[PDB]
Amino acid sequence: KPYFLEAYRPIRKGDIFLVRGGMRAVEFKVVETDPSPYCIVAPDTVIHCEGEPIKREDEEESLNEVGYDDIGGCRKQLAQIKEMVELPLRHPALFKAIGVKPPRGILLYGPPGTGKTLIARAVANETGAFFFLI
Amino acid sequence: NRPNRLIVDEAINEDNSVVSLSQPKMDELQLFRGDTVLLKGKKRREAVCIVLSDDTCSDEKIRMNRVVRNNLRVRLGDVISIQPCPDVKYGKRIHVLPIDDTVEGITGNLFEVYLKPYFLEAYRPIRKGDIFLVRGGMRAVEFKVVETDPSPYCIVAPDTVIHCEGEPIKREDEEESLNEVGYDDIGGCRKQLAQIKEMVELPLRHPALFKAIGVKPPRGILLYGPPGTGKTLIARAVANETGAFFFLI
Numbered sequence A: 001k002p003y004f005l006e007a008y009r010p011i012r013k014g015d016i017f018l019v020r021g022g023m024r025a026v027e028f029k030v031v032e033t034d035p036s037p038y039c040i041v042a043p044d045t046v047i048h049c050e051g052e053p054i055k056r057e058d059e060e061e062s063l064n065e066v067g068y069d070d071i072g073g074c075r076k077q078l079a080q081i082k083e084m085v086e087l088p089l090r091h092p093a094l095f096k097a098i099g100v101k102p103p104r105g106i107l108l109y110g111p112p113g114t115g116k117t118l119i120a121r122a123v124a125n126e127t128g129a130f131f132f133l134i
Numbered sequence B: 001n002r003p004n005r006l007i008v009d010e011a012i013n014e015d016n017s018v019v020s021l022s023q024p025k026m027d028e029l030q031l032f033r034g035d036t037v038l039l040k041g042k043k044r045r046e047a048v049c050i051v052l053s054d055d056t057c058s059d060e061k062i063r064m065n066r067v068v069r070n071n072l073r074v075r076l077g078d079v080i081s082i083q084p085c086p087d088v089k090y091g092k093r094i095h096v097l098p099i100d101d102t103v104e105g106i107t108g109n110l111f112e113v114y115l116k117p118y119f120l121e122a123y124r125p126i127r128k129g130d131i132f133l134v135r136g137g138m139r140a141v142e143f144k145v146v147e148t149d150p151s152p153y154c155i156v157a158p159d160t161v162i163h164c165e166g167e168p169i170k171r172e173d174e175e176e177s178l179n180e181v182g183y184d185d186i187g188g189c190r191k192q193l194a195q196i197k198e199m200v201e202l203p204l205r206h207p208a209l210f211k212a213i214g215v216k217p218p219r220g221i222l223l224y225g226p227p228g229t230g231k232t233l234i235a236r237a238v239a240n241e242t243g244a245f246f247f248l249i
């Protein structure tokens, strides 16, 4: 409470920081969103701390976001994938403007325990593209 | 027997609004290569184009490309008339417009780069309703001459102006797009493509003929070969080159 004072949280959901009334090391994360865009809070409002503090689902997400800096021994195989998927995902407008064929199927074959799903998560996060696991 | 009409056939020259004809039948119709000539087409249309004299084509068949065969709404196996046009006119401002969704995903005054070289020196004899097409930068797009300041058919001259504006308009249901496939879209299958054409050109362009004689036509064909050779492509091209309905499974 002693921090949303005359600086009523100009924020953007995803801004994480430190705020406490004590040992001065605790996070403040996004849980809810009544307004889709970020706003500036005001008193007289209503808040529900019914929510419970959680594990580092967010930190695991951050580790996945680290991506390329979390693996080793596949320098070549990680460069080939980058040049193959970055362009379609990052700038789809360029591919829309022209008639060219991107890829829609990639197959990775290798012995078990070689960090394959990890590579997929590392590539999806570094480019911001949504990732679904089956 | 009235050598004024003539049969259709494909074209080896790809340039738009251009044809090629037998060499001896230049006095019969009595006109020359440069002599621009108008050609009739069903649904009450006629399109003008340049002439040329060759030999490989028979003395009974014209050569032309898919664009005019589309605006003329006619396929192979058909026949139309013809007439010289020494009364042709120098086309003044004849407005055009990018007529497709192909306009999608693009920017710039593409009119200039795509047109100015295409029309330059071509002396393109153009008439209203033309659906000519030009290709550049990984893309292929067309335009329609909507306006003919002198009507209906005229020549292109470099002085002629182009106020190039307008909003992509909606192609009607009559015409069909350049995207749809054809024999010109395939290569390396001339032998079997010719076999298929000679096999199944009669039952679709001449069914009443089959009902007029007692003969058993084929009712099943099998094509065998490795994948990625263009078999479904061949089937769709044959369907599009005869107007027959196509169904896929």
Ligand SMILES: Nc1ncnc2c1ncn2[C@@H]1O[C@H](COP(=O)(O)OP(=O)(O)O)[C@@H](O)[C@H]1O
Pocket (backbone or CB within 6 Å): B185, B186, B187, B188, B189, B226, B227, B228, B229, B230, B231, B232, B233
């Ligand atoms: N002979 C050919 N001429 C033109 N394009 C071809 C040819 N063979 C293959 N292609 C191209 O590759 C693809 C051929 O694959 P496809 O038609 O599916 O063959 P199949 O059905 O036997 O797998 C087509 O999309 C076409 O663009």
